């Protein structure tokens, strides 16, 4: 029998409604294109930028209503989100591939499968290299039997980082860090006992997520410099902050 720590139950209760988010972003992009005439239609890159934008909107709404995070004053909330916004987007994408992804394609938040082949044919070297290490990370997580309880734990570990300067209530953040780490450790030890170091193996994925996240930020920033990013984009505001 599986055992799930009470804390992780609380974390799961704060999870977004995936079908609702999917339908919402799907409808948003379809309406966006509908409002544009033929020569105004967004390119693939433009669409994906607005898609990532809407995902980030959803992530901010998730955090705002979530346990522990809603306890902080807005100034601490901003600082935490300013630190980890791209990490959460990458983590969200990666886990989506672990669960909903077929190894030959990319599963988008809007629900479509985009073949990796299309990316290899239409994207430059930077994006392909970026996708390649995402693929490796997804493959690694699959081999570890990465599941939803561990995902929601890592999500909170990413959000409540202690590497954030100028934090007002840093010991609350430290408290969440310790509680979630402890719960994750107990969960892995109880439910995956033949993987004696699964906890450590999961933690080691965090610097890999952060490295991908930094490269992704840099890729997007330079795409913006060439004028390829569609106008106004919470992504871009997060970058310019």
């Amino acid at each position: 029998a599986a055992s799930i720590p009470h804390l992780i139950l609380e974390l799961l209760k704060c999870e977004p409604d995936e079908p609702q988010v999917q339908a919402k972003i799907m409808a948003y992009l379809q309406q966006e294109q509908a409002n544009r005439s033929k020569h105004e239609k967004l390119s693939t890159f433009g669409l994906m930028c607005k898609m990532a934008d809407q995902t980030l909107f959803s992530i901010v709404e998730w955090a705002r209503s979530s346990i522990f995070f809603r306890e902080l004053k807005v100034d601490d909330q901003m600082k935490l989100l300013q630190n980890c916004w791209s990490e959460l987007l990458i983590l969200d994408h990666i886990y989506r591939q672990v669960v909903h992804g077929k190894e030959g394609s990319i599963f988008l938040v809007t629900g479509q499968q985009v073949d990796y082949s299309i990316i290899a044919s239409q994207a430059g070297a930077t994006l392909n290299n970026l996708m390649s290490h995402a693929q490796e990370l997804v493959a690694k997580l699959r081999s570890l039997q990465f599941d939803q309880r561990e995902f929601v734990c890592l999500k909170f570990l990413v959000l409540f980082s202690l590497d954030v300067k100028n934090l007002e209530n840093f010991q609350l953040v430290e408290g969440v860090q310790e509680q979630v780490n402890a719960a994750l450790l107990d969960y892995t030890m109880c439910n995956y006992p033949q993987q004696t170091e699964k906890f450590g193996q999961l933690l080691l994925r965090l610097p890999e997520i952060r490295a991908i996240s930094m490269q992704a930020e840099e890729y997007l920033y330079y795409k913006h410099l060439n004028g390829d990013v569609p106008y106004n984009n919470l992504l871009i505001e997060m970058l310019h902050a």
């Binding site: 909107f57 901010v60 709404e61 705002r64 807005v74 909330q77 901003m78 989100l81 300013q82 919470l234 505001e237 997060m238 902050a241």
Partner: peptide
Amino acid sequence: NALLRYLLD
């Protein structure tokens, strides 16, 4: 980041 601040409210 006035936009992020707004969204959190």
